[PDB]
Design a protein around this motif. Structure first.
Motif, short mmCIF file in Angstrom:
data_model
loop_
_atom_site.label_atom_id
_atom_site.label_comp_id
_atom_site.label_asym_id
_atom_site.label_seq_id
_atom_site.Cartn_x
_atom_site.Cartn_y
_atom_site.Cartn_z
N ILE B 77 -17.42 2.29 -17.08
CA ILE B 77 -16.12 2.50 -16.46
C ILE B 77 -15.60 1.15 -15.98
O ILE B 77 -16.24 0.48 -15.17
CB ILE B 77 -16.19 3.50 -15.29
CG1 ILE B 77 -16.53 4.89 -15.81
CG2 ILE B 77 -14.89 3.51 -14.52
CD1 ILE B 77 -16.68 5.92 -14.72
N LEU B 79 -12.73 -0.41 -13.82
CA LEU B 79 -11.84 0.08 -12.77
C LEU B 79 -11.35 -1.09 -11.94
O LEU B 79 -11.96 -2.16 -11.89
CB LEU B 79 -12.55 1.11 -11.88
CG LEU B 79 -13.74 0.63 -11.05
CD1 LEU B 79 -13.32 0.29 -9.62
CD2 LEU B 79 -14.84 1.67 -11.05
N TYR B 81 -9.95 -1.69 -7.90
CA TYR B 81 -9.72 -1.19 -6.56
C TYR B 81 -9.17 -2.31 -5.69
O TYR B 81 -9.54 -3.47 -5.85
CB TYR B 81 -11.00 -0.61 -5.95
CG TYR B 81 -11.88 -1.64 -5.27
CD1 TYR B 81 -12.55 -2.61 -6.00
CD2 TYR B 81 -12.04 -1.63 -3.89
CE1 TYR B 81 -13.34 -3.55 -5.38
CE2 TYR B 81 -12.84 -2.57 -3.26
CZ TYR B 81 -13.49 -3.52 -4.01
OH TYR B 81 -14.28 -4.45 -3.39
N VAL B 103 -16.77 10.24 -13.92
CA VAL B 103 -15.69 9.81 -13.03
C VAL B 103 -15.91 10.33 -11.62
O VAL B 103 -15.64 9.63 -10.64
CB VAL B 103 -14.33 10.24 -13.61
CG1 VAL B 103 -13.23 10.08 -12.58
CG2 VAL B 103 -14.01 9.43 -14.85
N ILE B 121 -8.17 3.34 -6.08
CA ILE B 121 -8.91 3.08 -7.31
C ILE B 121 -8.03 3.39 -8.51
O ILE B 121 -7.43 4.47 -8.59
CB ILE B 121 -10.21 3.89 -7.37
CG1 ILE B 121 -11.15 3.48 -6.24
CG2 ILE B 121 -10.89 3.72 -8.72
CD1 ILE B 121 -12.22 4.50 -5.94
N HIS B 122 -7.94 2.44 -9.44
CA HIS B 122 -7.28 2.64 -10.72
C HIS B 122 -8.32 2.61 -11.83
O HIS B 122 -9.06 1.63 -11.96
CB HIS B 122 -6.21 1.57 -10.97
CG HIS B 122 -5.20 1.47 -9.87
ND1 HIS B 122 -3.88 1.82 -10.04
CD2 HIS B 122 -5.31 1.04 -8.59
CE1 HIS B 122 -3.22 1.63 -8.91
NE2 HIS B 122 -4.07 1.15 -8.01
N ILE B 123 -8.37 3.68 -12.62
CA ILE B 123 -9.36 3.83 -13.69
C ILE B 123 -8.72 3.28 -14.96
O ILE B 123 -7.88 3.93 -15.58
CB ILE B 123 -9.79 5.29 -13.86
CG1 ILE B 123 -10.18 5.89 -12.51
CG2 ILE B 123 -10.94 5.39 -14.84
CD1 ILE B 123 -10.27 7.39 -12.53
#
Lengths: 245, 174
Positions: B77, B79, B81, B103, B121-123
């Motif tokens: 992942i 990501l 933040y 997730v 948080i941006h995934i």
RNA sequence: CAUCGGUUCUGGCGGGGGGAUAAAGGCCCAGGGAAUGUGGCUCCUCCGGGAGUGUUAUAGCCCUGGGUGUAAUACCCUCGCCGGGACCGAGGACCGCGCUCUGCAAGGAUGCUGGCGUAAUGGUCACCAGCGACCCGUCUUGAAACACGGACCAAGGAGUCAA
RNA sequence: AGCGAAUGAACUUUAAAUAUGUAAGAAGCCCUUGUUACUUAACUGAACGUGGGUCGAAUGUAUCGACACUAGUGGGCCAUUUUUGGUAAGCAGAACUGGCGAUGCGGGAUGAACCGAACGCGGGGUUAAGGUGCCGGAGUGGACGCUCAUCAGACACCACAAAAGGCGUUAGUACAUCUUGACAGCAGGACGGUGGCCAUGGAAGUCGGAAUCCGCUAAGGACUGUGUAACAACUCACCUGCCGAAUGUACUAGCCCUGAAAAUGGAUGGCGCUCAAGCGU
RNA sequence: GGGAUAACUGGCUUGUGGCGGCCAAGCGUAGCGACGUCGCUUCGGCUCUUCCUAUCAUACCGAAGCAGAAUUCGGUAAGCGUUGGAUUGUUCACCCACUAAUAGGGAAAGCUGGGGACCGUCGUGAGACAGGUUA
RNA sequence: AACGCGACGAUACUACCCGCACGUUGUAGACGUAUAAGAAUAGGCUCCGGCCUCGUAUCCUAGCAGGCGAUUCCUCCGCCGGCCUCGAAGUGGCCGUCGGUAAUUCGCGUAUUGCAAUUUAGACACGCGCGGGAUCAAAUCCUUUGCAGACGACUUAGAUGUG
């Protein structure tokens, strides 16, 4: 994470070489190979090799390479495809441990005569077997350790007592003179550094050096060489009993 | 966080006289329900593009279910933040059975380790590592070791919380 | 206690619909691929087991398409059917809306039974127990706080009359 | 947003969020020709008249308006948002809205200014804020992690307080070294011109000033420290052999320690709690 | 003479000055910018009980050309103590000694010596009044 | 500790001890109020075979609130003694006597408390009664003392004596 030792940044003039010196070592050997008729591989197994500088001066028409074994092996080429000249890959078979290269334009028998008559006395270095027992006389210790007669000798320097005592000599300063027991030499027995036929460690080897007692011999052992004209590598006395690469 | 499913959200700007047949954008959104899924679509679109909810239209909302929810997979992942200092990139690995499981673990792990919230948080990317040697993190690497087998020392037994008094001292061996 | 009405809490069961007419999965069919490489083979080997090779053999796995297939199941939404409790019974001939009509669960509880018929239920005091609870009035102020009056009881005690 | 439209917050096709003024019918709009002392060059305009055409957004409506008469009122405190100005920091002033004043009840251990919610006498059911280790009604509930504090923390997050100190611990970013053997270590080399020049009683790499080159090189500074009166000797830098697979540096984000405290004995409300009864979801 | 106002401070305070330049990781895409370095310089006395430590002494430690003796700087420590006179000449009020030493504060407190405010009248380039009233 | 505890001496009546007879007596609350290893939890138990998540285990558990008579049984329970053992705030074991006793199977009895109403049932303490054994006490006031003292309190002495 945290709780790590602090690496000291030395305030020094000379840095570590790394990749640049390795490539320089390759270039020096590769340009040397075409210029000479024979490539000798020699062994200095457990020697201090401070006399190799005198060898270079005597053999000023030759070239001696004493670097990393792996770097020297692949500089010469360890396989027939990456090899530089015919038969070089079987020369790299001799390069196993602490070895060196000797490029010469001389008679091969001339090299054998020089390195067989060459012999110098050097310090022991750890792992060697002691040929004789060394004992410091009980009393005022001198700068040789009962090898030069005391009448011709001078007392050891007083700044060596902590260094001698650290290696395990029960000495003391009596009126500015290092002494083993008493200055008259009656209080205690002597000190035995090394015994007959016993492997000596760095503690005993170090004690021998400050007393300037030479127990080993410096000698260069030739393993084999390579002829540029014939492209054929021959076998010399030393090599038949020595591990190969 | 919560219980999540992947949502395929396709939306468009409302067709005008000058611009018929608009662009039909698409995103994959992890949300607890369809109401939240559409909100995240317009919140993300309002940042990226210049399409708002008033002049927008949701074309389709669909649930993406995992193809093999019985195969153990390693997920990576990527990501971003934001903290008191700024916005940071981090790459992390999760050994799970579904993307939604991966997730959900990430939200718990970021909250536990960095006190990061859902709004922070941006995934950017969730990917199945198609093969080992793509695993970089040592904690996942030890789980994909050859012939993995470990004991379970000091296992506390499960005693009913209403069983106040026990006649024998319990054992923690099995 | 039995049969009802109103409200409500809480179990179980039988169907319908929708997603990728769930996604998966089991069993078949046809391809492709790899290793945390099964057998087989080679080398190290201390009972033990390692290293290498290579694609299913004396294990298996992954990916793609098709069949069974309108499969099952989870989740969401829905139509009903039984079960176990709790609180309540307002009104007082008929009239109404109705239904499953010799009648009825349909504009509000009746039926059967037991003990007792007296301090038994109930009520008043005092006390113990659990929880709750600043001392009144006046004055000031946005508000508190300060300040003033209060030892106790009985009787008297202050917006009336006239123009 | 664009300037592959022109021009250049002061540019624009378009256009935010945000409050905010006015208007939305038969108590209405236009036309028309009769008069008029008003007006015009004029029966021409304006006023006074005549006639003509689903009652012209949504939602609510527990009625609306006019007149007369009668009693109590003329304060303010705090907070949000916007805004003006100032200080080292405080702070002072305006506009709106909300809470309190005339308000009981549930919660925050307690309570002018906080959250929930407004009130006849009772029965049943369900909740809000807040909680479920015991005081205390309800979980020693479930999942994944983090933290050990020599008076942790349990919602004050403002000040102390910084570009701050931690050989505490966890996650991450960037750069760099590595079977051409990286980091650590052990065994050895660390040499020659050369006691380089000046100076000094003496001064040779190491009391001082300034230059700091070359050779042999695998590498070795006209030298990093110990040392000598001066040497000597040791040590570091650097190199090689043995060993063998991962390391180093600098930052970022969590939690933890310090980051200053006086004086009767006391406070997350109390006991007490450490894979919590602390912290995040 | 009028207007706003009872008045202040409460996790306050303590050991390292200000101003200007240079350097400066960052923030940012010119401006803020720490540590260093440079430049210019009412009061006094009296007290008893307890507490604090920011320790003067006594106990124990670390360091210093600390030879011994005597010390100096720092650390843990409040267990135990912290005096008798002068104040009769001058001043920034402080000398004489004794002693192991003659530390600093809080509870903020009482005795004892030192050292009012309104009108009225007559005038104001300015004060006067045994004129009146009062907490 | 004047609301913590222990040992000992003497205790007149009342009733001190023992036995049973009950209480219209009090109990923060009987109803099978049953159950002793120690120690570790990255180990332990054993019968030395083996066993250990799990006290959802073991014991006891049938009979007019539990009758009478058999059939049949040496199993369990209780009281007394003798020998010993239990002291941290003190008991259990062994033996003997006597009494009771479904492990198996019967016969006689239960009714009427009327369709439920705490199935008044245990232990401790307290009190009232009999019939058996046992005992015949102190303190204070008073006078006195000064080892003490505001007053109380305290150290003393008053019964034949070293008064």
């Amino acid at each position: 994470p945290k709780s790590k030792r602090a690496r000291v940044y030395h305030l020094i003039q000379v840095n570590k070489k790394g990749r640049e010196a390795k490539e320089r070592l390759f270039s020096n050997i590769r340009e040397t190979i075409p210029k000479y008729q024979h490539c000798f591989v020699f062994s200095v197994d457990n020697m201090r090799n401070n006399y190799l500088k005198d060898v270079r001066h005597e053999l000023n028409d030759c070239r001696i390479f004493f670097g990393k074994t792996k770097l020297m092996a692949r500089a010469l080429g360890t396989t027939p495809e990456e090899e530089q000249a015919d038969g070089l890959h079987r020369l790299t078979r001799y390069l196993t441990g602490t070895v060196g290269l000797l490029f010469t334009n001389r008679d091969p028998a001339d090299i054998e005569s020089y390195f067989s008559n060459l012999s110098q006395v050097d310090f022991a270095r750890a792992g060697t077997v002691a040929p004789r027992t060394v004992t410091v006389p009980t009393g005022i210790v001198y700068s040789t350790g009962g090898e030069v007669p005391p009448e011709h000798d001078v007392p050891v320097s007083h700044t060596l007592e902590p260094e001698l005592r650290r290696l395990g000599m029960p000495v003391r300063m009596i009126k500015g003179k290092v002494c083993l027991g008493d200055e008259k030499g009656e209080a205690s027995e002597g000190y035995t550094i090394c015994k007959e036929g016993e492997v000596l460690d760095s503690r005993q080897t170090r004690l021998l050096k400050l007393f300037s007692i030479c127990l080993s011999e410096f000698k260069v052992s030739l393993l084999g060489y390579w002829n540029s004209a014939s492209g054929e590598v021959t076998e010399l006395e030393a090599g038949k009993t020595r591990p190969k690469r | 966080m919560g219980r999540l499913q992947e949502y395929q959200v396709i939306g468009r700007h409302l067709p005008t006289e000058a611009n018929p047949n608009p662009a039909l954008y698409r995103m994959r959104i992890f949300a607890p329900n369809e109401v939240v899924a559409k909100s995240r679509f317009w919140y993300f679109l309002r940042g990226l593009k210049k399409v708002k909810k008033a002049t927008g239209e949701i074309v389709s909302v669909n649930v993406i279910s995992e193809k093999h929810p019985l195969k153990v997979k390693n997920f990576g992942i990527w990501l971003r933040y934001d903290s008191r200092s700024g916005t940071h990139n981090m790459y992390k690995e999760y050994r799970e059975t579904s993307r939604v499981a991966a997730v959900e673990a990430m939200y718990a792990d970021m909250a536990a380790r960095h006190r990061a919230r859902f709004r922070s948080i941006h995934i950017l990317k969730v990917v199945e590592l198609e093969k080992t040697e793509d695993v970089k993190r040592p904690y996942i690497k030890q789980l994909v070791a050859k012939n993995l087998s470990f004991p379970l020392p000091h296992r506390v037994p499960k005693i009913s919380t209403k069983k106040i008094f026990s006649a024998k001292r319990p054992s923690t061996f099995s």
